[model samples]
Target: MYLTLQEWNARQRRPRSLETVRRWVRESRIFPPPVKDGREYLFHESAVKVDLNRPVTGSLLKRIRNGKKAKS
Candidate 1:
């Protein structure tokens, strides 16, 4: 379940650059976070997922149908 930074990057659907992953590490964006061992960073299984964005609970159309005023 543990893989180095380069290995994990290669496994992505759309491969990302080292800089991007490094940035993720710096920003603490990777799930469970990663640890730097020697010169490489290792991540846990499913550490990064595109589904990180929160799910939408209510649609704008639903709000409009409910007679809610458009946000100012």
Candidate 2:
């Protein structure tokens, strides 16, 4: 999933400032590395997810703990 900075920003649960993402680049905390497109920068989706602290959710929550009828 190729996502732009702004695009990823709008999708966050707690949106982050643009400067924060750039800081990740300056701090070398990005994953899968970054891509250079001319004088601009392109970051990977996973890296951005982490930069946002991943304070979010995934697909539909499934009952993974199957066969767990622990008598309460």
Candidate 3:
């Protein structure tokens, strides 16, 4: 489903939170870059969703899989 910026932002549990969205965009690297309309930015819905649903793998999960505690 295609979603506009507003629609995508609204679907988020926390809407219009700059910090949250900024982190998501950075981590996801969904699109090559955001498209600009004047001062507004846009991202593709499919790309964004793909990033959002990506599998998580890191120290936490790795430790659990190995039955070891995560070290600080």
Candidate 4:
């Protein structure tokens, strides 16, 4: 279940911009965190999916909402 950033973002009702994706990669501390290969950062699709399927804690939802606001 390898998805490009765009594909991953599209899975959400509100898709994330590249910057937001980068921020999530840096901040979430999810398993299989994004890795740097040369100049590019790549995320593991399965790891991200696992994260998304986990119970949505209040803090996690708040952070996601706040992060969206911060982007605006």
Q: Which of the numbered candidates is closest to the native, going by highest lDDT? A: 1
Point out the higher-scoring one by TM-score: 1 or 2: 1
The C-alpha TM-scores of every prediction are 0.59, 0.49, 0.39, 0.45
- Off by more than 4 A, model 1: 49-72
Candidate 2 backbone clash number? 0
Highest-scoring model, TM-score: 1
- lDDT per residue, candidate 2, 13-68, as tens digits? 57788787677678875666667777567656775433545544766755655564
Q: Which 10-residue span in candidate 2 carries the lowest summed lDDT?
A: 47-56
Query: Whole-model lDDT, candidate 4?
Result: 0.60
Model 2: lDDT to the true structure: 0.64
Q: Deviation in angstroms for 68 in model 3?
A: 47
lDDT of 3 by residue, 1-72 (tens): 345566667875558666666676668655645666665567566545444554655554333344556878
Model 4, span 1-72: residue lDDT tens: 345666666775568597876677767745666566665665566655333654654653333333334553
Clashing residue pairs in candidate 1, if any? none
Error of 3 at 39 (Å): 1.1
Instruction: In model 1, state the lDDT of residue 29.
Output: 62
Candidate 2: TM-score?
0.49
What pairs collide in candidate 2? none
Candidate 2 Cα misplacement greater than 4 A, ranges: 48-72
For residues 1-72, could you state the per-residue lDDT of candidate 1 as single tens digits?
688888888897668698987876766666767777887888887786443664556756533344556776
Going through the candidates in the order shown, the clash numbers are: 0, 0, 0, 0
